[PDB]
Design a protein around this ligand. Structure first.
Ligand SMILES: [Mg+2]
Ligand SMILES: [Mg+2]
Lengths: 205, 203, 97, 175
RNA sequence: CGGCCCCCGGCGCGCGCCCGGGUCUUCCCGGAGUCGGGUUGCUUGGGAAUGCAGCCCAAAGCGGGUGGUAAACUCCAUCU
RNA sequence: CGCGACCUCAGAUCAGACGUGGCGACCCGCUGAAUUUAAGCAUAUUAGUCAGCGGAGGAAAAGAAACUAACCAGGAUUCCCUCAGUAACGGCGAGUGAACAGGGAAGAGCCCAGCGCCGAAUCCCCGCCCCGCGGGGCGCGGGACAUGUGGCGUACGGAAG
């Protein structure tokens, strides 16, 4: 059943497979169906934008992916706390809330606190009957457009430092090398043992 | 603070003051019928922390289940199979006995939706269970809009689909790496999702 | 001198010191509840795997009295939270006398 | 007995809580006065007995109670079994009365399983302060007399006469 | 494109309910024959048992679950 | 003994309601073989599928972490692309074989028991009339449930005074 040189093959068709198959003869029909549910939804509601709330800025989980920025889930309260808005007020204003999200940095915390007040800067509200509790005049002179698109404040913005040019100094060109890693790794798998060999000198008495 | 004392006293059922009336009403239930109507839940703390509210509408059956895993219903043990399939006597029936108790308690009453249930006794052969029920069409349950979630007709027969507290313990689902054996919906929905051939249109 | 491998790994970032979450506090003793479970070991009693366990703990062996709870309560680390509080109730039944 | 407990069901009877035909018309004379008179406090203390386990249990671990009238038969036997040891430990007295349906008619309900006292009227305090001594004589002075005790373990009258007949044939042999 | 008939969601009088916010002080704070362990059957890619079920043993509260090689000690991480 | 309060119970062509049955394309729970492949064949495979049995709906199931991670941390579920025919399993033979990352579709969150305060402030039925359609209500009086605990505030993101 095999012949002259070729791949060895395990094709997974020993199981019954012709009674579960899924031809996508409706994937054009499902694309222009779920465009009607974006046409006749984003006009049906409001001058509120399409594509949902403001999402915060979020840095990725894998070592592979920690260098990059992603539209996360919700500002996890603290960003509602340093910026100072009420949590059940926030999700009717148009601000997403994700309570099980934590903050264990101060660098990333203020990165959304300015973002939230920046959203609150570019927000205009409609008071019901124009007595205006804590909203200004005529509707920002007008609503200027009907709907906004693909995210409020461009949630990617994968910005990068310029770091233009420098003069190599004395300390920078002599030290920071490969041997600073082989001894760095040697204080990762020869550190706990050297805690134990100093216990040998405290029991030598 | 009363129910916290009822809870913690009941949660020590090998001391001598507990295992007297733990077993004097194992006998007192074994002389009644197989399924039965108790007029009031014989451990009141547990039934209401599962959702009992002592008013018009709810009804609390205790029923009996014989213990033990299932014997394979094949005549004279002749399973007629390959030698990994001669399992007549050592088979264990992957749905729990507490949910068999909720089934035939909900099977007898066609017009009673079931909330959930709990454990009230064991002999060596019998394993008793109260089962607390909810009448859908009573007007004290069709009002009270925190209970109108059960008069909705998608909650017909929450056992034979397996949607109670005890039944869904045996469905295998949950979150985590321990339960991604069933990662889509239910156990035989992931088997459709993995083991189908998802050829595209521009394949 | 940041370095991604070694002992001091990773990008140097400042750390927020903040009050811990309220689900993180689960099993604090909370005096109201200690009053319940101390009232209840004189209205209910002990079990017959620990009526025997103290009468091996007061006299003969404490390795084997651990190794008797080890067999009859699940793990080894559950049996070092039974043995050294079976002895404590036995202490306050002995040294309150 | 039925004799010492005669007073307790008659002392408590004048602390019966507010029934239907007087709850309907206490709201009214407070309303007919509210648009005319402006009275500050009609009921500064309600002389009343509390009902039910989940009220009487809390009112001992705040020591807000005077006396605990506790019943005999409950749907769940345990429901009650901690409440003697709880009131002895705090020090509020308790007495066990006959029938959980005899004290149920102190309150116009079927079965109420416990009633207790928080504030008796101080002009009839001495009726309380005469029999609360005999209550804590019978129970709270006798905790390690009542805690230790075991029940049952007595044979039937047909299976004890055949035991006691064997005592004749030994006390005949010693004659 | 009109005219003709019937039904949809959204004016305004008479209905009906109707004080939230920040700091400080004190107080409260949780689901048991369940969790887990021993064994047995099924099952999974889950491999020194991933899930499930039976039977036995049966918890604690700075406790418990998880951290993909059995285990003891030692921190920590996350979760309730 | 007679009367009464309850507790566990019966009886009815009592008043008023309810459930069974059919279809089964998709969905949910359970029980579930053999032909076939291994060039034989017992483990394995075919397969947790065919058949059998029970449950429903216009969708169902799932769901607001007893999670994934181990770094600059993500953040309910479901679905598609990738992860990947990879880790791993297997007479380590034949063969079966996930998930996290990452990009998209949609993106909605919440309730209670318990610990506590409010004099059960709760609900059903019955009769009258308010007054309105094809009826449902706040009023007015009478029987129940319920203190073995109804209703308000309350849910771990903290809450209460
Ligand atoms: Mg009833
Ligand atoms: Mg239909």
């Amino acid at each position: 059943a095999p012949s002259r040189n070729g791949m060895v093959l395990k094709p997974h068709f020993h199981k019954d497979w012709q009674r579960r198959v899924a031809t996508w003869f409706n994937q054009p029909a499902r694309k222009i169906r779920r465009r009607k549910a974006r046409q006749a939804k984003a006009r049906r509601i409001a001058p509120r934008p399409a594509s949902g709330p403001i999402r915060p800025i979020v840095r990725c989980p894998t070592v592979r992916y920690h260098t990059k920025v992603r539209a996360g889930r919700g500002f996890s309260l603290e960003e509602l706390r340093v910026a100072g808005i009420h949590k059940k007020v926030a999700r009717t204003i148009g601000i997403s809330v994700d309570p099980r999200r934590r903050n264990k940095s101060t660098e990333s915390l203020q990165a959304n606190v300015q973002r939230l007040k920046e959203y609150r800067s570019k927000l205009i509200l409609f008071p019901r009957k124009p007595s205006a509790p804590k909203k200004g005049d005529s509707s920002a002179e007008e609503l200027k457009l009907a709907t906004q698109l693909t995210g409020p404040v461009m949630p990617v913005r994968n910005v990068y430092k310029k770091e233009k040019a420098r003069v190599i100094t004395e300390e920078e060109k002599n030290f920071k090398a490969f041997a600073s890693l082989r001894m760095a790794r040697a204080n990762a798998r020869l550190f706990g043992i050297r805690a134990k060999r100093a216990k040998e000198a405290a029991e030598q008495d | 603070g009363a129910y916290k004392y009822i809870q913690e006293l009941w949660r020590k059922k090998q001391s001598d003051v507990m295992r007297f009336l733990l077993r004097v009403r194992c006998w007192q239930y074994r002389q009644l019928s197989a399924l039965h109507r108790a007029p009031r839940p014989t451990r009141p703390d547990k039934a209401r922390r599962l959702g009992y509210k002592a008013k018009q509408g709810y009804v609390i059956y205790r029923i009996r289940v014989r213990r033990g895993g299932r014997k394979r219903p094949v005549p004279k043990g002749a399973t007629y199979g390959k030698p990994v399939h001669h399992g007549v006597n050592q088979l264990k029936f992957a749905r729990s006995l507490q949910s068999v108790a909720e089934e035939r308690a909900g099977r007898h009453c066609g017009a009673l939706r079931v909330l959930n249930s709990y454990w009230v006794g064991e002999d060596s052969t019998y394993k008793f269970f109260e089962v607390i029920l909810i009448d859908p069409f009573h007007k004290a349950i069709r009002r009270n809009p925190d209970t109108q979630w059960i008069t909705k007709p998608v909650h017909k027969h929450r056992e034979m689909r397996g949607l109670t507290s005890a039944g869904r313990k045996s469905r295998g689902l949950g979150k985590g790496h321990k339960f991604h054996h069933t990662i889509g919906g239910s156990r035989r929905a992931a088997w459709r999702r993995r083991n189908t051939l998802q050829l595209h249109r521009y394949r | 001198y940041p370095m991604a491998v070694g002992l001091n790994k990773g990008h140097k970032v400042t750390k927020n010191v903040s009050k811990p979450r309220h689900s993180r506090r689960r099993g604090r003793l909370t005096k109201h509840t200690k009053f319940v479970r101390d009232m209840i070991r004189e209205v209910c009693g002990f079990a017959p795997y620990e009526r025997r366990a103290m009468e091996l703990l007061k006299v003969s062996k404490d390795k084997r009295a651990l190794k008797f709870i080890k067999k009859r309560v699940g793990t080894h680390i559950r049996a070092k939270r039974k043995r050294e509080e079976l002895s404590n109730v036995l202490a306050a039944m002995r040294k309150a006398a | 007995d039925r004799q010492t407990a005669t007073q307790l069901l008659k002392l408590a009877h004048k602390y019966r809580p507010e029934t239907k035909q007087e709850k309907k018309q206490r709201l009214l004379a407070r309303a007919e006065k509210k648009a005319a008179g402006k009275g500050d406090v009609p009921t500064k203390r309600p002389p009343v007995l509390r009902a039910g386990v989940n009220t009487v249990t809390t009112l001992v671990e705040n020591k807000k109670a005077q006396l605990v009238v506790i019943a005999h038969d409950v749907d769940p036997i345990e429901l009650v079994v901690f409440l003697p040891a709880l009131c002895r430990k705090m020090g509020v007295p308790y007495c066990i009365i006959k029938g959980k349906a005899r004290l149920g008619r102190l309150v116009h309900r079927k079965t109420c399983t416990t009633v207790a006292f928080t504030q008796v009227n101080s002009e009839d305090k001495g009726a309380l302060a005469k029999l609360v001594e005999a209550i804590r004589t019978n129970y709270n002075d006798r905790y390690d007399e009542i805690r230790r005790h075991w029940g049952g373990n007595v044979l039937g009258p047909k299976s004890v006469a055949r035991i006691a007949k064997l005592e004749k044939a030994k006390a005949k042999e010693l004659a």
